[PDB]
Amino acid sequence: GSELPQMVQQLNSPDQQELQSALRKLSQIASGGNEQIQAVIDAGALPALVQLLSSPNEQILQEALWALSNIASGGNEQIQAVIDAGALPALVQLLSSPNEQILQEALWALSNIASGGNEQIQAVIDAGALPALVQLLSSPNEQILQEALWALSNIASGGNEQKQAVKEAGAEPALEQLQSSPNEKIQKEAQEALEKIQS
Ligand SMILES: [Ca+2]
Ligand SMILES: [Ca+2]
Ligand SMILES: [Ca+2]
């Protein structure tokens, strides 16, 4: 509580140990439900967190992604605050990262954002995420494939405009190809996503 302003102030500290300590403490608060998430937002954390998505330090990048994922695990208005802070262009670019850990974490944050209402889903679409998400359905990495399926399934839970955008990005044949997957969990998830898109 009382320590939140000092934590936020230190999210751009010139001392890297001080920055990382505040960032680690910040994600813990943002895990305590929507009221705590809102306290983090209202303390001004979002601009500093979005700036950290450009850090060359992959450790800081990962911790910033966790913090944003946790904020985006809240209500639709809390997701919208993440969107309004400009997180989506950086997240979409990180879908092309060669670091599988960073990629998984960027996908996680994007999927949480796409778990909001139709306005939050449409912002993900408008940020250009669909082509990369569809391409990731070809990934040999089970964890990445699982998260790309999750992201697309979340988007396909939106309105007809959102489902049609998923169709136009070529998701259908990629999900049909997964029906022959040896992995039953993936096959069933892909089939459910197909049904959502075609509904
Ligand atoms: Ca500061
Ligand atoms: Ca959610
Ligand atoms: Ca829905």
Side-chain angles (χ1 to χ4, degrees), residues 61-175:
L61 180 52
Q62 169 163 267
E63 298 154 353
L65 289 164
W66 292 342
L68 287 171
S69 287
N70 276 286
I71 295 170
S73 76
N76 289 349
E77 49 285 322
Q78 300 173 319
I79 298 171
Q80 192 60 47
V82 174
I83 293 169
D84 291 347
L88 288 174
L91 292 172
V92 168
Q93 288 304 128
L94 292 167
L95 296 181
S96 297
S97 173
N99 182 320
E100 65 186 348
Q101 292 289 108
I102 298 300
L103 174 50
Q104 293 170 8
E105 295 300 354
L107 267 176
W108 194 281
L110 282 170
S111 296
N112 272 357
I113 293 170
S115 77
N118 295 351
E119 166 176 18
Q120 292 72 54
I121 297 173
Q122 189 60 40
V124 177
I125 297 168
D126 291 345
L130 285 177
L133 292 175
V134 172
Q135 182 64 33
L136 289 169
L137 297 177
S138 295
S139 171
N141 182 290
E142 180 172 343
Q143 181 60 225
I144 293 177
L145 174 59
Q146 181 174 106
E147 292 183 43
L149 276 168
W150 171 40
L152 290 167
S153 180
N154 286 354
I155 295 168
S157 282
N160 285 342
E161 166 178 17
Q162 285 76 55
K163 300 170 192 294
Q164 183 64 23
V166 176
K167 288 194 193 180
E168 291 166 343
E172 288 176 324
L175 299 169

